[PDB]
Design goal:
mainly beta; binds potassium ion; Genome polyprotein (chains A, C); part of a larger assembly; binds stearic acid; binds chloride ion; 3 chains; virus; 4-stranded antiparallel beta sheet; 9 strands; 5-stranded antiparallel beta sheet; extended; Jelly Rolls
């Protein structure tokens, strides 16, 4: 008939000890161990809001003095949350963003603000009065600095199945000449666009404004553990480290025989 | 029609069409008026 | 269960004619036609012995004057059998070889002869007395010129499934420089070795000897008909033709309107 023949790892509580791997090298007693493992579930480890951005709109100075700012969404500028995330290679999750806004010294004034999510390809505001603030399709939040911090849920938005903290490659084909090495490690699947903020008015606001953005990871999944960062972070988009001062992971001592 | 002009594999495609329902396309608040009542002018 | 879904043409007698393709364009009668098709069966067409070699061992002259001859078996030197065979691309068959031997004028004398089949790789006789005539493994026939013609059956011996009259290629890899174009069309699967003949004696025979070899194809199979040779043959191993005198396949006449 056929012409060709060739054609869960961690349970809810800690393991008990039975009376005589401890009970393998030493004599043991029985211990009814009911210590929980829930707090080390990745969800509890990650679902804690952490700082991911500090945006300023001063009234004086040489930057963002026009009452609006387009902040390219890049969550790798703060060491604490970054190191936790980088314990894994890939992570998938929804996120809760909270916007804590105040003047530079922490005082609050009755000032109306608008935060708009500008996905990749949507036109960015070019002034406090730009037509883009009409926000007929993009999601916007109007809130006062005297209101409690604004807060919204952002779903998992990557074109890929998970965000990836490490992408060993280039975004496109071509020669990869020295002049473009900045391309290395750049994963467009993590590029979520712009976050735009403005004081709501055609006239300039007399208040300097500082916005602290916190992100809380939720409904998280993680894949492929990796060694934890042991050198200070230098740049947002690469793992460069200071070659002249390579830190040892552990503190030192004089002799291997004395504490 | 791919599987008509080229040889295809089976793809169990579960991509949702909900976000393009006109309700989701339109039910987003947008600016329709700016009214001013200045004290001078 | 499966992760990937994508993974006889001519009868014994001539057709009859039925009373009304003749009976399609003209009115016909019934003809009970019992004309046989047997004589055109390839076996009857081919199983007729034909000349394939004429070997001479003169006593005087400048060739084969030592009472022995090593004849490289190449059956394409005689036009009649060659053209019939070349009607096909591949042919498989056994063969009956008959050896008609006499002096140059047809007279017969009491002379003992030996014919030995020397397959490719067997040592060839280098004299009338060579050790190879011991013929301890090769097949030999000892016969007198006064006996009836010697005759033997040779089986189908090619390493391939059929002999091939046309091989569009080269026997080996390599550059194929102009100096070696003789290689083109050479099929080793048809190369059956050597046919060796000698007068049986350490002393020279006073008789000039002419051997005519006839081959009768039998138990034949043939594949892929091709246009029949329409130019005189020039060489044994290629279809070269005389370019300055290309023969028309049909005779000519003065006008297309008169016979
Ligand atoms: C209406 C106001 C809401 C706007 C909130 C800002 C939304 C920003 C997009 C959220 C993307 C979260 C995934 C981040 C993946 C990390 C990318 C990176 O920094 O390399
Ligand atoms: C004992 C004496 C018997 C020797 C008889 C000669 C045998 C020659 C070998 C027969 C081979 C027949 C196949 C020929 C195929 C055609 C090859 C060619 O000429 O291109
Ligand atoms: Cl507006
Ligand atoms: Cl001998
Ligand atoms: K237990
Ligand atoms: K018939």
């Amino acid at each position: 008939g056929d012409p060709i023949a060739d054609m869960l790892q961690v349970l809810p509580t800690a393991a008990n000890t039975e009376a005589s791997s401890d009970k393998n090298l030493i004599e043991t007693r029985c211990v009814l161990n009911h210590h929980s493992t829930q707090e080390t579930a990745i969800g509890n480890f990650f679902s804690r809001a952490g700082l991911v951005s500090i945006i300023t709109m001063p009234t004086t100075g040489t930057q963002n003095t026009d009452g609006y700012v387009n902040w390219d969404i890049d969550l790798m500028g703060y060491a604490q949350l970054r190191r936790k995330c980088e314990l894994f290679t890939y992570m998938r999750f929804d996120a809760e963003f909270t916007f804590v806004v105040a003047k530079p010294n922490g005082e609050l004034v009755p000032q109306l603000l608008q935060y708009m999510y500008v996905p990749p390809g949507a036109p960015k505001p070019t002034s406090r009065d730009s037509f883009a603030w009409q926000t007929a399709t993009n999601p916007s939040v109007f809130v006062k600095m005297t209101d409690p911090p604004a807060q919204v849920s952002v779903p998992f938005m990557s074109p890929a199945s998970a965000y990836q903290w490490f992408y060993d490659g280039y975004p496109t084909f071509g020669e990869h000449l020295q002049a473009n090495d900045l391309d290395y490690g750049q994963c467009p699947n993590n590029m979520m666009g712009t976050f735009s903020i403005r004081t709501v008015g055609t006239e300039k606001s007399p208040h300097s404004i500082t916005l602290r953005v916190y992100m809380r990871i939720k409904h998280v999944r993680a894949w492929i553990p990796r060694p934890l960062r042991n050198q200070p972070y230098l740049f947002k988009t690469n793992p460069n480290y200071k070659g002249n001062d390579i830190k040892c992971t552990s503190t030192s001592r004089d002799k291997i025989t004395t504490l």
